[PDB]
Each structure stands twice: as C-alpha cells, then as structure tokens.
Design a protein around this ligand. Structure first.
Ligand SMILES: CNCC[C@@H](Oc1ccccc1C)c1ccccc1
Ligand SMILES: CNCC[C@@H](Oc1ccccc1C)c1ccccc1
Ligand SMILES: [Cl-]
Ligand SMILES: [Cl-]
Ligand code: NA
Lengths: 565, 565
C-alpha cells in the first residue's frame, strides 16, 4: 500500500488541467454560440455563469481531491451514500471517451491526408473521396452559388470528403443499418489507442511529460493562425461580427441557457478528471489559485480561438461574396469541412492544414488521456487490485474502449456518436454534478469544507464561496437539469430522423446511471447492519467518523448543521 | 480451500453424462447421415470408430478427471505446456453455448405456440407468421405437386412459420445487415438463461436433481412417439429404408468421414464437460463401466431416435405421395419444419407438439447446463477467487452468453449461428482434442496413466486400450483434422452466399484458439527461470514432480518413456 505518487511539479498539473479544459469544444462550439447568442453580448452571461458557477464547481473539486486524497469514486468516504455518484462519473467519462477517440481518429486521418501535395478537399474528381456526382462543383472556381447555407451544403468537395472518403456515410442508412467498421478508420483508431496506452501505461509521470507538448503546441498553432488570418481580407468583418454587442438578445432564455451549458461543458467541472488530477498533489497546494487560473486560461483560450475562427469565416464570406450567417458552422462540420476549405484557398495550404490537424489531434489526445486516467484512478482507488497491476488494467481499458468504439467508426457511426454524446454526456453528467453538489453542500456541510480548506491552506474560503457552494451552484445545476429534461427534443440529424427506439436507448442509459446511483444508496442502506436510524448514521457520516455512531451524537441530524452557512 | 463437492450418487453423474451427450445432434443429424451414407451399412463404421476412438477418449477423460479432481484447464498440472488446451476447450464450450441457447429459445418459443387450438403451421395465412406475398399453398391438401428436395420447399406453412414468424429472415439480407434482436426471441432467451442460472447457481447438487427430469423425459417422449408412429401408415417403408443395408457405399470414402464426425460430435469427447463431471466423482469410482455405458446409451438412443424420425418421414412421404429421399431433412429444418408438419396432420396435434417441444427443450437445457458448468468449473479451479463467488460468476457468465447471443437471435442471426457453430466447434475442438490426446499419450506417457488408473481401479487398462490411447486415437484425430482442413468449403446457406470476410472471421477465431494454446506454451517457456533444458524440464514434467528437475533425472528425455506401449 504505497502512498499516492504526486506530480513532478505544479506546472504539470496546470498543463494537464488546461489540456483537459481546452479541447475541441472551446474551438468549435464557443465561437458559434457566441455570435448566435447576442454576438459580443454573450460574454456577460458567460462571466455571470463563470463567477457563480463552474469556478465554485472547480475549486470544490480541487479541494475535495486534495484533502481526501482518493479517486473520483473513493472520494465519497465522507458520505458513503454517494459513492454511486462516484461510479456514475467514471461511467460517463468512459462513455465520452468512447466517441471522443473517434473524432481523434478522424483528425489523425485528416492529418495523414494533408501530406499530399494536392489536398483532397481541393479537387472534386475522386480525390480521396467518392463523388456522388450530384452537383460536384468547386467552392467558387467552377461556378458560384451559396443559395441556402454553407454548413448544410453537402455537395462541396470539402463536405463530400468528410461525407464519403472518411466516414463513408453513403453506404449506410441510420441506426438500423450502421454497417461494418472502416479499415482505415480502424487503423487510425488503433494508432490512437496505442499512443494513449503508451502515454498512460507508465503512470502520472509520463503523462505530465506529454501534457507539456499537448498544451504548448495548440496555443502556438492558434497564435500563428490568428497572426496569418488577421492580414487576410475579410478578417475585419468577421472580427466585428464576432464582438458586436446587442443587449436585446439577453431578454430571451436562449442565451441564458446556452451560456450556462457552454460554461459547464467547457470547464469540465464534475468529471472525475479534476479530482484525479488534484489527488496527485501536495496537501498544502493552493487550490484557489489553480482553480481560478485554469478557468481564466480556458476562457481566454476560447475567446482567442473564436477570434481566429471568425476571422477565417469572414475570409471565406469575403472570398465567396456571402454574409457571415451563411458561413456560420459549429462542431465537427466547422473543424472538418469549412476550415479545411479555407486552408485550401490559402497559399501553402499543406503546411496550414498539417499544423491545424496537429493542433486538433493534440487537443483531442490531451482530453482523452485526462478522461482515461480519471477512469483508471477512480477504478483503482476503489479496487486496489487494479492499482497494483496498472499496465494490464490500462491495456484492458484501451482495448475495451477500442472495441466499443468500433461501432462508431463504421459507415454510419455519426448517428450513434450523436446519440451517445448528447444523451449520456448531457443528462448523466448533469444528474451526477447535481447529486455531487447537493450531497457535499448539505450532508457534508460547507463549514466542514471550509475547515478542511483551512487545514490545507492558511486562508479560509470567503462567505461568497460558501454561498455559491451551498445555494447558488446546487440551484444552478438543478435548473440546468430541469431545462435539459423539459426542453428535450427527439434525436435528429442533418437529413435523417432517428428511430423511435434510439431515444429509448438513450433514456435507458440515462436511467441506468440514475438507478446505479440509487442502486449504491440502497446497497449501503441494506449492507449495513442496524436499524432505520442506525444505518442512516453510517450512511451520512464519514467512514473515519463511524466510531461516534454508537455514541448517539450525529451532527447531520442536528438542525445547526444544515442552518450553518 | 474446501475440498471439491462430490455428487449425490453415481446415478446423478450417469444422468448428467447421458444428457450432455443427447443434444439434438443425435436426433436431427444421425438419422439423415445413416440413410445417406449407405443406409443400413452406416452402423459398421459408426461402431468401429466408436470402439477405436470414442470409448478410449471417453475413458481417458473420465479417468484423468477422476484422478486429478481438477477443472478442464487445471487438469494439465501433469504437463504445464498443454495447459492452454484447457482455456481452448473452455472458449470452445463458451462459443458453442453462445448458439446452443438460440436453438433452445427457438424450441421454447415453439412450445408456447403449441398451446393453441389451431396450431400456426396447420394452415396458411397470417397465423403467427408473415406471408411472403407469394401464395402460401397447403403442404399437400391443395396441390400435391412438388419437386425432389422437400427440405428446400420454402413455401409450405411449416417452413414459412420458422422463416418469418420465429426467425424473421425476410427482414434481413445476410451478416452485413443483421438487424436488431427480436423482442419475442429476446424474452425466450431471457427465460432460458434465467432457468439456466437458477439451475446452475448453487452447484452440482441442484444440477444433479435437474438432470433426473431432463434425462428421463426425452426417453419417454421418444418411446411414446415411436409407439404411436409404428401404427401410422408408411412407417414400415421408412423403417426399411432406414435399415436398408448396402455395402457398396462403404468404399465411397465419405461414410468414414461422416460417421467419425458424428461419433466425435455426439459423444462429447474432448470437451471440458466430461472432465468437469468426472472431477466431482469418487477416487475409486469405475470410469471403465461408466465410459462404456454412456457410449452404449448414446448409440442406442441415436438408433431408437432415428427409427422414430424415419417412421415420421415415411408417414409424411406416404401422405404426401412422395419418396423417402424427398422428405429427407437434417438439423434445424428437420426439428422445426418437417416434424411439426407431421404433427399437424396427426389427430390431437396439440398434445404431440407440446410433448415434442418439451423433449427438445429438455435436450437443449441439459446440454447447455453441462457446457456452462464445464466453463464454470474450468475457470473456478484455475482462479479460485471465482470459485468462492460462484453465484456472481455464474450470473456474469450467463449474462455474457445472453449478450453475445443477442447477435444470433436477430433477423439474420442464422448465418452467424452457422458460421460460429461450424468454424469454432469443428476446427477448434479438433485441434484441442488432438493436442489433448498428444499431451496425455506421448508427453505424459501411457505408463503413468495406467499407473494412475491402477491406483483408482484395481484392474489395469488392457493393451488394446493403451494402443488406442497412444496410436489409434491420435492418428484418428489427426486424420479428421487433415480432412476438415483439406475438404474445407466456403460458407453458404440455402440461397445466400457468405461474403469472403465471413471465412476470414471464422479462421480468425480458429487461429485465435490455435495461438492461445501456443501463447500459453510460450508463456510457460518464458515464465520459468533457467536454461533451455531447465525450462523444458518444468514444461514437460508434472507440477508435483518439479523437485526432481535439479536432480537431473527426467523420464521424458529418456527413450524408455517414449518407446513404451
Ligand atoms: C471540456 N473538458 C471536457 C472535455 C471532454 O471530457 C472528456 C473527454 C474524453 C474522455 C472523457 C472526458 C470526461 C468532454 C467532451 C464532451 C462532453 C463531455 C466531456
Ligand atoms: C453432443 N455433445 C454436446 C453437444 C454440444 O456440446 C456443448 C453445448 C454447449 C456448450 C458446450 C458444449 C461442449 C455441442 C454442439 C455442437 C458442437 C459441439 C458440441
Ligand atoms: Cl467554454
Ligand atoms: Cl452420434
Ligand atoms: Na488538451
């Protein structure tokens, strides 16, 4: 039973949490959601949900991981009635990494294709893609035309590539007929999982060496891309459209929900990655400074990435003689169709495409390593047998992730990708973070958390942080959960409708998690020997505080514990 | 480390080994193979191969299991190099139970359908099936016009039922588009695996009680069916065609292969089921009498089952105004299409259908319980952790079998079922029994086996049994392996042709097993410490005989051990 091995220094922890926070999300979702939701008036709700939420969900996780030096699952020894929330977060991090490696393999394939002197998205004549022949016109060289939209136009070579040569979506029909995994995508995913294993099989030390590169490279790529794009024509229009301020959009609830969702799904709060990274830290490390700096760097990175993305979008709109709303895109489309199309028109397209795909690959691999290491730590700190045999456990995790991601690399897959991502990530992690906040803040109390932080660092948390942990953040997460439940819509694609049972399978996974947490609470209620009040005592008190159960002095039963803020 | 739990009595072991043998392969394959391969001259090669290989293999397995009192994988402590063959046969019994439960669920679904006043296959229409939109003609009530192959008549209501209402083969095109598992087949397989878990969760005690019914019922069903069929018209012609003796086809070079395969796949020799069932027996139990009685009961059961099956076939041929070669069928077709069709024409079709389907369900359940208990014992005796938690291990095994059998209960599941059965069972168990015979006859030597049997039973094995164990059976298995390898043909169904990658996946599973055994031989070569002759010593000597390695007295290295019969 050797003690937990910490990071080499705080720099490695900072780079790891930055690489986990800064990912493809802050690049593909934040820019579009910024302009769509009030333009430059999105930063106000962004900061309003960053200063009352996210940061209270980041500082809390860092402090809980540092004081209680355990994984995501085993950190719930302070209240055993919530270890199911510690298993649900591991299951969510596994389900997310299931489809994240598919996008990583897509980025790897795009990188490998970028080495050609003539990029495939430049030519429509069967260049690494399958021409459907339905209007195989050039972007603007052969014949102009952007009648409807640039994101839903699936006849441009840049979109035809991702449609046919990479995904092979023309040989599938939907969920009912996905097909077989593609051989090239299978090899790309194999290389990805091999790199993941070779980075994670050693431990936290080599990961601290890989996060150096995977963090220092994407910032350099973004800086070079922005510097080269601001000189391009049409960049000023995109920049002005990005930061245009209109407070009239704030009256609606669309921005009021989108800013919260973006903050929550971009800061990475609630996932086991933060607890895992704060578990290998000194007992007197400053969680406050790290939690503030990580979120600040994440927001600044999102902003400077949106700047360059909308600069490229304005360049495209100027070259194609269209408006900004036409070239507006988000997600996989933005990262794989419109941006490589803009790279192709640029001089020396090979270097720009290669560096952009290297940046995307690094951003994906950093988050994948973070999530997989979080899963490994959470499953090891609970079952110490897997902690001793770490290499075999990591190999098994990587192989299982590859096998269960084989379904997402087939001729279809993007439908299963959307189903898994949306349902699992959204509702499961929302329920998980709501349970975490409620459980900690109420059953463990904010005064005990402040005392633990005082034991860690000299200064105590302010009254503002206590209020945020007690009322603001729990009510915020509850409101987000209620919105996700009420405003739920059936799964839909660009030109496909999901089967009536796909939503049922998604809600089945959701209910599996949301019973597995009550499955653990019921197991703890039943496994403990005693009675109604005898079992609740062991349920709502720390494991090391189980001796005072017979003494009949339970602080949680007292009203002063709940009233204490 | 409590000792191995013994059987209640020898009657339980006898009923278990009788059940594991009667699987439906004796009733759907033996009757057709007898008439096809020389009519009444098929018994001579059958009993010859039985005496020379089957009875020796059965005796060897029973004696080795009784002497070692260990699982299928753990029984190789006498030679660590061949221990991988235990994992091989475990994986084989798992892959076989993967598709065996599918046929069990088919029989269970046919059972519930029989609890109707008007059975589905009696008349055409949308009665529990789906019309192919081609006019469903009555078997022989409307139009007597038919062609030579009656088995391939896919327009009769009896075949249309199995094709549409049970399997739903009209909504699939092959392995490339299998579809989704059927809900009724899902419920049937769930009930099957629930019964299997409730029978096998406690241990050998409850199984020893279930084998009583599962063995005593099918014999009564066969007796009643034969007694009722001999009175029916056309039974005499079918019986005469069954016993029609022709020694001309003896030299066809095809009856010797078919009889050998029938004996080898109907006795159950080489599988872990026999070692598992002989691992709980007394140390002074008579393996010779039991091994002879099991094979005799199996052959007599196959013969009396073929009698009734060909009686029913002759009745059908007389009622349908066709010859015997026309109604000739084998396998799932025989058990699910032609026989229920004969039941429908009989008066009181409900009782006969119910009793026949209960017989088939019992014949499936006993074999499934034996196969699952083999894997359970083999993995428990190797990893004693699973032995302690027998209930959770059995639950996990049953749940994994159900999940991996979901692929076989879908629309196009029969193709994957045939692929798995043929490839895995045939070549994997052939290589496994070849390796077992070699390791027990040449490496471990027949002299040590005879000495162990002398300790178990007072009488020593005769010279004929030693010859069969050392030369006859190994050469027989090698010949069968060579025939299966050379005469291999690409997979095909009645109409659909398997794609090239189906054979690739089948040979991939084959090579997976046939490297996993050498994977273990290489592991034992590398794990041991010493030079080449020091590692080979520990590899070819028993675990309890590892002390004499340093003494430089290895019996296997001497030619006296090899040159001794
Ligand atoms: C933004 N930081 C979180 C990124 C990413 O987190 C990962 C990525 C891979 C594996 C596991 C996890 C938890 C994530 C992406 C989309 C939905 C949820 C999480
Ligand atoms: C007839 N002897 C037993 C039949 C059956 O044996 C089973 C059945 C299920 C699981 C494991 C085994 C060994 C079998 C079926 C087809 C090929 C080989 C064996
Ligand atoms: Cl963000
Ligand atoms: Cl047989
Ligand atoms: Na990163």
């Amino acid at each position: 039973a050797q003690p937990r091995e910490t990071w080499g220094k705080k720099i490695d922890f900072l780079l790891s949490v930055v690489g986990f926070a800064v990912d493809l999300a802050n690049v593909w979702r934040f820019p579009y959601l910024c302009y769509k939701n009030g333009g430059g008036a999105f930063l106000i709700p962004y900061t309003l949900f960053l200063i009352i939420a996210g940061m209270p969900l980041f500082y809390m996780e860092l402090a809980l991981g540092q004081y209680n030096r355990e994984g995501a699952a085993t950190v719930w020894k302070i209240c055993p009635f919530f270890k199911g929330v510690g298993y649900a977060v591991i299951l969510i991090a596994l389900y997310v990494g299931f489809y994240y490696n598919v996008i990583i393999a897509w980025s790897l394939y795009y990188l490998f294709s970028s080495f050609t002197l003539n990029l495939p998205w430049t030519d429509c004549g069967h260049t690494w893609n399958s021409p459907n022949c339905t209007d195989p016109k050039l972007l603007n060289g052969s014949v102009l035309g952007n009648h409807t939209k640039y994101s839903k136009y699936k006849f441009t070579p840049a979109a035809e590539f991702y449609e046919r040569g990479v995904l092979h979506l023309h040989e599938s029909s939907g969920i009912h007929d996905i097909g077989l995994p593609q051989w090239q995508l299978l090899l790309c995913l194999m290389v990805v999982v091999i790199v993941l294993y070779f980075s994670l099989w050693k431990g936290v030390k080599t990961s601290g060496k890989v996060v150096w590169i995977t963090a220092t490279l994407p910032y350099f790529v973004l800086f070079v891309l922005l510097v080269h794009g601001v000189t391009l024509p049409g960049a000023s229009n995109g920049i002005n459209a990005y930061l245009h301020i209109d407070f009239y959009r704030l009256k609606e609830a669309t921005v009021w929900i989108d800013a919260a969702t973006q903050i929550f799904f971009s800061l990475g709060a609630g996932f086991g990655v933060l607890i895992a990274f704060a578990s290998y830290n000194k007992f007197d490390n400053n969680c406050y400074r790290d939690a503030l700096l990580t979120s600040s760097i994440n927001c600044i990175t999102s902003f400077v990435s949106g700047f360059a993305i909308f600069s490229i979008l304005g360049y495209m709109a100027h070259e194609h003689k269209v408006n900004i709303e036409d070239v507006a895109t988000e997600g996989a489309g933005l990262v794989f169709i419109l941006y490589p199309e803009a790279i192709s028109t640029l001089s020396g397209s090979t270097f720009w495409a290669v560096v952009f795909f290297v940046m995307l690959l690094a951003l994906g691999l950093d988050s994948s390593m973070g999530g997989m290491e979080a899963v490994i730590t959470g499953l090891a700190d609970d079952f110490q047998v897997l902690k001793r045999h770490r290499k075999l456990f990591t190999f098994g995790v990587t192989f299982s992730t590859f096998l269960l991601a084989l379904f997402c690399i087939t001729k279809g897959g993007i439908y299963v990708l959307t189903l898994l991502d949306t349902f699992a990530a959204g509702t499961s992690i929302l329920f998980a973070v709501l349970m975490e906040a409620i459980g900690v803040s109420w059953f463990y109390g904010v005064d005990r958390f402040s005392n633990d932080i005082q034991q860690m660092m000299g200064f105590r948390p302010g009254l503002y942080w206590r209020l945020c942990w007690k009322f603001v953040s729990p009510a915020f997460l509850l409101f987000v959960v209620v919105v996700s439940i009420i405003n739920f819509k059936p799964l839909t694609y660009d030109d496909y409708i999901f089967p009536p049972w796909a939503n049922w399978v998604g809600w089945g996974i959701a209910l599996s998690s949301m019973v597995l947490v009550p499955i653990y609470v019921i197991y703890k209620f039943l496994s403990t020997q005693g009675s109604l009040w005898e079992r609740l005592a062991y349920g709502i008190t720390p494991e090391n505080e189980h001796h005072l159960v017979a003494q009949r002095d339970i602080r949680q039963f007292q009203l002063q514990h709940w009233l204490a803020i």
